[PDB]
Design an enzyme around this catalytic site. Structure first.
Site, PDB file in Angstrom:
ATOM      1  N   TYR A  45      -1.688  -9.300  -2.722  1.00  0.00           N
ATOM      2  CA  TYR A  45      -1.130  -7.822  -2.685  1.00  0.00           C
ATOM      3  C   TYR A  45      -0.963  -7.568  -4.446  1.00  0.00           C
ATOM      4  CZ  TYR A  45       3.658  -9.098  -3.332  1.00  0.00           C
ATOM      5  OH  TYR A  45       4.913  -9.560  -3.675  1.00  0.00           O
ATOM      6  N   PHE A  55       6.085  -3.648 -11.539  1.00  0.00           N
ATOM      7  CA  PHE A  55       4.636  -3.949 -10.889  1.00  0.00           C
ATOM      8  C   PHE A  55       5.047  -5.618 -10.228  1.00  0.00           C
ATOM      9  CE2 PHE A  55       3.614  -1.194 -14.261  1.00  0.00           C
ATOM     10  CZ  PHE A  55       2.373  -0.604 -13.812  1.00  0.00           C
ATOM     11  N   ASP A  56       4.393  -5.787  -8.994  1.00  0.00           N
ATOM     12  CA  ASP A  56       4.650  -7.303  -8.507  1.00  0.00           C
ATOM     13  C   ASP A  56       3.302  -7.445  -7.838  1.00  0.00           C
ATOM     14  OD1 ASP A  56       6.028  -9.311  -7.014  1.00  0.00           O
ATOM     15  OD2 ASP A  56       6.136  -8.060  -5.320  1.00  0.00           O
ATOM     16  N   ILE A  75       9.097  -4.273   4.410  1.00  0.00           N
ATOM     17  CA  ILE A  75       9.308  -3.025   4.805  1.00  0.00           C
ATOM     18  C   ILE A  75       8.436  -2.306   5.864  1.00  0.00           C
ATOM     19  CG2 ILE A  75      10.190  -2.175   2.362  1.00  0.00           C
ATOM     20  CD1 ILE A  75       7.399  -1.068   1.739  1.00  0.00           C
ATOM     21  N   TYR A 101      12.564   1.726   1.074  1.00  0.00           N
ATOM     22  CA  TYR A 101      13.778   1.537   0.918  1.00  0.00           C
ATOM     23  C   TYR A 101      14.711   2.749   1.073  1.00  0.00           C
ATOM     24  CZ  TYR A 101      11.853  -2.997  -0.657  1.00  0.00           C
ATOM     25  OH  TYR A 101      11.259  -3.899  -0.601  1.00  0.00           O
ATOM     26  N   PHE A 118       0.429   0.040  -2.825  1.00  0.00           N
ATOM     27  CA  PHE A 118       0.142  -1.308  -2.567  1.00  0.00           C
ATOM     28  C   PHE A 118      -1.501  -1.369  -2.370  1.00  0.00           C
ATOM     29  CE2 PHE A 118       4.464  -1.474  -0.989  1.00  0.00           C
ATOM     30  CZ  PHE A 118       4.961  -2.511  -1.366  1.00  0.00           C
TER      31      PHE A 118
HETATM   32  C1  LIG Z   1      12.925  -4.697   7.321  1.00  0.00           C
HETATM   33  O1  LIG Z   1      13.476  -3.977   6.028  1.00  0.00           O
HETATM   34  C2  LIG Z   1      13.354  -5.131   5.078  1.00  0.00           C
HETATM   35  C3  LIG Z   1      12.851  -6.176   5.110  1.00  0.00           C
HETATM   36  C4  LIG Z   1      12.587  -7.008   3.844  1.00  0.00           C
HETATM   37  C5  LIG Z   1      12.997  -6.460   2.701  1.00  0.00           C
HETATM   38  C6  LIG Z   1      13.148  -7.403   1.409  1.00  0.00           C
HETATM   39  C7  LIG Z   1      11.962  -7.121   0.341  1.00  0.00           C
HETATM   40  C8  LIG Z   1      10.407  -7.411   1.008  1.00  0.00           C
HETATM   41  O2  LIG Z   1       9.591  -6.671   0.244  1.00  0.00           O
HETATM   42  C9  LIG Z   1       8.521  -5.993   0.966  1.00  0.00           C
HETATM   43  O3  LIG Z   1       8.793  -5.729   1.665  1.00  0.00           O
HETATM   44  C10 LIG Z   1       7.747  -5.496   0.065  1.00  0.00           C
HETATM   45  C11 LIG Z   1       6.374  -5.709   0.840  1.00  0.00           C
HETATM   46  C12 LIG Z   1       5.708  -7.067   0.549  1.00  0.00           C
HETATM   47  C13 LIG Z   1       5.731  -7.557  -0.881  1.00  0.00           C
HETATM   48  C14 LIG Z   1       7.039  -7.084  -1.716  1.00  0.00           C
HETATM   49  N1  LIG Z   1       7.357  -6.231  -1.330  1.00  0.00           N
HETATM   50  C15 LIG Z   1       8.019  -5.016  -2.225  1.00  0.00           C
HETATM   51  O4  LIG Z   1       8.461  -4.076  -2.155  1.00  0.00           O
HETATM   52  C16 LIG Z   1       8.200  -5.385  -3.657  1.00  0.00           C
HETATM   53  C17 LIG Z   1       9.402  -6.530  -3.888  1.00  0.00           C
HETATM   54  C18 LIG Z   1       9.192  -8.014  -4.350  1.00  0.00           C
HETATM   55  C19 LIG Z   1      10.143  -8.918  -4.425  1.00  0.00           C
HETATM   56  O5  LIG Z   1      10.109 -10.259  -4.917  1.00  0.00           O
HETATM   57  C20 LIG Z   1       8.978 -10.242  -5.404  1.00  0.00           C
HETATM   58  C21 LIG Z   1      11.488  -8.360  -4.147  1.00  0.00           C
HETATM   59  O6  LIG Z   1      12.737  -9.022  -4.431  1.00  0.00           O
HETATM   60  C22 LIG Z   1      12.947  -9.994  -3.312  1.00  0.00           C
HETATM   61  C23 LIG Z   1      11.544  -7.171  -3.875  1.00  0.00           C
HETATM   62  O7  LIG Z   1      12.996  -6.622  -3.449  1.00  0.00           O
HETATM   63  C24 LIG Z   1      13.149  -5.247  -3.043  1.00  0.00           C
HETATM   64  C25 LIG Z   1      10.643  -6.182  -3.679  1.00  0.00           C
HETATM   65  C26 LIG Z   1       8.044  -4.492  -4.762  1.00  0.00           C
HETATM   66  C27 LIG Z   1       6.815  -3.741  -4.916  1.00  0.00           C
HETATM   67  C28 LIG Z   1       6.629  -2.552  -5.828  1.00  0.00           C
HETATM   68  C29 LIG Z   1       7.267  -3.007  -7.296  1.00  0.00           C
HETATM   69  C30 LIG Z   1       8.488  -3.685  -7.183  1.00  0.00           C
HETATM   70  C31 LIG Z   1       8.458  -4.914  -6.221  1.00  0.00           C
HETATM   71  C32 LIG Z   1      10.382  -8.796   0.518  1.00  0.00           C
HETATM   72  C33 LIG Z   1      10.243  -9.416  -1.115  1.00  0.00           C
HETATM   73  C34 LIG Z   1      10.158 -10.584  -1.120  1.00  0.00           C
HETATM   74  C35 LIG Z   1       9.767 -11.654  -0.410  1.00  0.00           C
HETATM   75  C36 LIG Z   1       9.638 -11.208   1.011  1.00  0.00           C
HETATM   76  O8  LIG Z   1       9.393 -12.248   1.863  1.00  0.00           O
HETATM   77  C37 LIG Z   1       9.422 -11.739   3.486  1.00  0.00           C
HETATM   78  C38 LIG Z   1       8.765 -12.870   4.200  1.00  0.00           C
HETATM   79  N2  LIG Z   1       9.811 -13.902   4.308  1.00  0.00           N
HETATM   80  C39 LIG Z   1       9.221 -14.863   5.559  1.00  0.00           C
HETATM   81  C40 LIG Z   1      10.194 -15.883   5.611  1.00  0.00           C
HETATM   82  O9  LIG Z   1      11.542 -15.771   5.501  1.00  0.00           O
HETATM   83  C41 LIG Z   1      12.027 -15.115   4.579  1.00  0.00           C
HETATM   84  C42 LIG Z   1      11.089 -13.893   4.449  1.00  0.00           C
HETATM   85  C43 LIG Z   1       9.977 -10.095   1.443  1.00  0.00           C
HETATM   86  C44 LIG Z   1      13.672  -5.324   2.549  1.00  0.00           C
HETATM   87  C45 LIG Z   1      13.582  -4.274   3.669  1.00  0.00           C
HETATM   88  O10 LIG Z   1      13.987  -3.239   3.837  1.00  0.00           O
HETATM   89  C46 LIG Z   1      15.199  -2.771   2.883  1.00  0.00           C
END
Ligand SMILES: COc1ccc(CC[C@@H](OC(=O)[C@@H]2CCCCN2C(=O)[C@H](c2cc(OC)c(OC)c(OC)c2)[C@@H]2C=CCCC2)c2cccc(OCCN3CCOCC3)c2)cc1OC
Length: 128
Positions: A45, A55-56, A75, A101, A118
């Site tokens: 992604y 960006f990520d 999410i 979020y 994304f």
């Molecule tokens: C049920 O609700 C939630 C569940 C989980 C989260 C945490 C954020 C989630 O990130 C995401 O879900 C999305 C989609 C998948 C890729 C990363 N995501 C992001 O938003 C990125 C992201 C990457 C991140 O790290 C690389 C983050 O830091 C942990 C992060 O923190 C909010 C967010 C952002 C994309 C837009 C530009 C800024 C970065 C995430 C980030 C990094 C790794 C993740 O791994 C999930 C899978 N593993 C599986 C094994 O056990 C641990 C979890 C998930 C918040 C939730 O809600 C408050």
């Protein structure tokens, strides 16, 4: 560009039909199966906040991003969006704050009421 295009032309894939998650298939995949809830999914992604500030990418870590579908590990928009994809497909997903979020955000990375864009590629999926 791509975010403006998906914001106006994307298919509404939410159950409430509130335009909270919008999708455009950019590259058609192979096989008529999509993953089931509980399946382990492997993606690549490129993500950003709709305003180009943060960006990520899975490519920044040189490895596919692995998670269990429909378990709340990502999410809401991802749990809903990735479930509609076929293996090999590349889609564009526009996510409103209610499926991301929300009003609380995820500081310092994500501000309050942020819309996320994304480009996701579904590499593969396998059952529990
Ligand atoms: C049920 O609700 C939630 C569940 C989980 C989260 C945490 C954020 C989630 O990130 C995401 O879900 C999305 C989609 C998948 C890729 C990363 N995501 C992001 O938003 C990125 C992201 C990457 C991140 O790290 C690389 C983050 O830091 C942990 C992060 O923190 C909010 C967010 C952002 C994309 C837009 C530009 C800024 C970065 C995430 C980030 C990094 C790794 C993740 O791994 C999930 C899978 N593993 C599986 C094994 O056990 C641990 C979890 C998930 C918040 C939730 O809600 C408050």
């Amino acid at each position: 560009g791509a975010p403006a295009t998906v914001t106006e032309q994307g298919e509404d894939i939410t159950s409430k039909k509130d335009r909270g998650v919008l999708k455009i298939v950019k590259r058609v995949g192979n096989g008529e199966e999509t993953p089931m809830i509980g399946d382990k999914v492997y993606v690549h992604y490129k993500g950003k906040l709709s305003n180009g500030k943060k960006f990520d990418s899975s490519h920044d870590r040189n490895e596919p991003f692995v998670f269990s579908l429909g378990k709340g590990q990502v999410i809401k928009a991802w749990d809903i969006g990735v479930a509609t994809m076929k293996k090999g497909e590349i889609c564009h997903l526009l996510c409103k704050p209610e499926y991301a979020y929300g009003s609380a955000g995820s500081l310092p990375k994500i501000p309050s009421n942020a819309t996320l864009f994304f480009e996701i590629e579904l590499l593969d999926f396998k059952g529990e």
